[PDB]
Amino acid sequence: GVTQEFIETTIQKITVDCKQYVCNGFKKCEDLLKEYGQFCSKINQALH
Amino acid sequence: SNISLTYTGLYPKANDLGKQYIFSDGSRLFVSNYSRQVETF
Numbered sequence: 001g002v003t004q005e006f007i008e009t010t011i012q013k014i015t016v017d018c019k020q021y022v023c024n025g026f027k028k029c030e031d032l033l034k035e036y037g038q039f040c041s042k043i044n045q046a047l048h
Numbered sequence: 049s050n051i052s053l054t055y056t057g058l059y060p061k062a063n064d065l066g067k068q069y070i071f072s073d074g075s076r077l078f079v080s081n082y083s084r085q086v087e088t089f
């Protein structure tokens with residue numbers, strides 16, 4: 001008898017351009033987002 | 049203090065040579081074309 005088993009070893013690695021994802025390259029949006037702290041850098045570091 | 053922040057503002061470009069202005073000393077004075085050169089603020 002053959003028992004088949006799948007054990008995953010990877011997931012798809014995703015890096016997100018936080019600035020472009022949130023603001024789409026708009027200066028007003030970037031100025032408004034800067035009030036939220038260092039969100040994009042922390043997101044980049046976490047994903048990396 | 050002891051923190052790196054991203055700032056958006058009025059800053060010079062990196063490795064910018066800029067414009068150099070040289071002044072001399074004199075009777076009749078010696079000057080360049082600076083007074084007739086109008087730059088853009």
Ligand SMILES: *[C@@H]1O[C@H](CO)[C@@H](O)[C@H](O)[C@H]1NC(C)=O
Nearest residue numbers: 080081082083084085086087
């Ligand atoms: C001096 O500046 C004038 C403009 O004020 C310019 O037309 C002229 O060519 C300059 N002379 C130089 C760079 O020798």
